[PDB]
Design an enzyme around this catalytic site. Structure first.
Site, PDB file in Angstrom:
ATOM      1  CG  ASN A  24      -9.531  21.742   7.606  1.00  0.00           C
ATOM      2  OD1 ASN A  24      -8.533  21.453   6.926  1.00  0.00           O
ATOM      3  ND2 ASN A  24      -9.451  22.076   8.884  1.00  0.00           N
ATOM      4  NE  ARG A  42      -0.665   8.663 -13.136  1.00  0.00           N
ATOM      5  CZ  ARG A  42      -0.134   7.543 -12.668  1.00  0.00           C
ATOM      6  NH1 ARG A  42      -0.867   6.740 -11.906  1.00  0.00           N
ATOM      7  NH2 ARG A  42       1.115   7.217 -12.978  1.00  0.00           N
ATOM      8  CD  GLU A  66      -2.535   7.584  -8.868  1.00  0.00           C
ATOM      9  OE1 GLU A  66      -3.072   7.756  -9.991  1.00  0.00           O
ATOM     10  OE2 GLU A  66      -1.898   6.546  -8.604  1.00  0.00           O
ATOM     11  CE1 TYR A  86       2.863   6.529  -8.871  1.00  0.00           C
ATOM     12  CE2 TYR A  86       5.202   6.354  -8.391  1.00  0.00           C
ATOM     13  CZ  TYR A  86       3.892   6.083  -8.064  1.00  0.00           C
ATOM     14  OH  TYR A  86       3.579   5.382  -6.935  1.00  0.00           O
TER      15      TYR A  86
END
EC number: 3.2.2.22
Lengths: 258, 258
Positions: free
Chosen positions: B190, B175, B172, B75
């Site tokens: 895009n 992870r 995230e 984090y």
């Protein structure tokens, strides 16, 4: 039917490994793998022409015997020695009818009044699995006992003991990498010894293990299965993960879900 | 601390993939893998010299910002823009003390009164994760907002929205392979769009998933975890098997058992 040959004469762990790898290869189609464990063909809809494989065994005494294995469970259904064929008692009509396709050219076909399950066999042999030595020597002898039964040379308790040896060294080793490993060790050190509890418990649990894996939730068992370690102590199995290195083939229990 | 660079300018799915692969590589040591999922270093006993990694982000506007990531949870703990450093409110003294080791050479070090958890951040941004678009464009803008905060150019709700973007696209994605996959798609076409429920539920469940896997019985969960699919429908997880392709790193919860 496909035939795979193997001789106990000068067998090494590599020749035995190759043999078991060839049997497994003939047994499964690669069409159905579940948590990396191959599943045997479903008996429903399986054509008779693809129902059996044959294992021709020879020994140092130059005697041969051919066992017939049912492709749906990897179990021995009967055998041929010279001019005669013997089949275990069929447990249903489809099965009774399928075996008519085997060894069609032998002159004497006999069907035993007893089946090939271990209980019956242990009863006929007057000994339990835990007291019957396994190894290349026991196997060599089993081939001769099977062969001489066709000649009036083998007594029933001996014939039964012989099947117990053959079934564990061929069918059980094909079903379980663990059991094949145990046989390899016996061959490597030329040891003959009876199976320990881990081996017997796996043999007894093959059908339940097959169902538990196939009906698991993402590999997790709804209820654990208790096995025993080599030293006789219990050991609970909660997930298919720990059996991946132990079980090589499973009997078809259900279709795989989406 | 190790630094990994990434620019939104001309980013492609391959440049983004390489970036995330480099971050994961710096985050884990390869010493602890559990059901093939790498575990982050345990905070107890971890030396400060190995406690953080830095991610230097640049954008088309040629502005840069450096985020500091805590190696034990992946984090964001704070950032540096030019002459100033900003840190989220430490949630304990060890943490307050560890961050003193970061950006020691900036002239203005500030520590926010609020922490970096999503609830606080959503509250400050006046918007929920489900309504904040993600993509390379949002990221490019976030870098500029973070950078201008050091100049009086960024309002607090904007700063908070910017962190929400950065944390999901960096922490995230590192992870969860699943979340990284979602970002790759946005970059490939895009597209900028807010995260769907599967993404939000995974983010909310990372800590529980880490504990459930580490305390599982051979991979089987004692109690299932409910997640949501892209379409918002629930989906129960009973085993670690199905998360292997989804979760990339886990926070250290317990020692691995024998």
């Amino acid at each position: 039917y496909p035939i795979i040959n193997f001789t106990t004469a000068g067998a090494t762990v590599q020749s035995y490994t190759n043999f078991i790898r060839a049997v497994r290869g003939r047994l499964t189609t690669g069409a159905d793998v579940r948590h990396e464990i191959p599943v045997l063909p479903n008996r429903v809809g399986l054509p008779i022409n693809q129902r059996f494989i044959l294992v021709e065994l020879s020994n140092h005494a130059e005697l041969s015997v051919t066992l017939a294995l049912d492709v749906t469970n990897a179990y021995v259904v009967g055998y041929r020695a010279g001019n005669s064929a013997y089949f275990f008692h069929p447990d249903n009509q489809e099965d009774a009818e399928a075996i008519t396709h085997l060894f069609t050219d032998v002159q004497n076909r006999y069907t035993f009044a007893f089946g090939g399950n271990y209980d019956r066999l242990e009863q006929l042999a007057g000994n339990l699995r835990e007291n019957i030595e396994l190894g290349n020597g026991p196997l060599e002898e089993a081939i001769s006992a099977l062969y001489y039964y066709s000649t009036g040379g083998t007594q029933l308790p001996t014939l039964a003991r012989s099947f117990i040896i053959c079934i564990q060294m061929i069918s059980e080793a094909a079903r379980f990498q663990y059991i094949e490993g145990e046989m390899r060790t016996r061959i490597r050190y030329n040891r003959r010894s009876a199976p320990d509890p881990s081996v017997i418990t796996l043999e007894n649990s093959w059908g339940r293990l097959s169902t538990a894996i196939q009906e698991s939730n993402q590999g997790a068992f709804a209820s654990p299965i208790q096995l025993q370690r080599r030293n006789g102590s219990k050991f609970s199995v909660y997930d298919v993960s720990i059996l991946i290195p132990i079980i090589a083939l499973m009997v078809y229990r259900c279709a795989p879900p989406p």
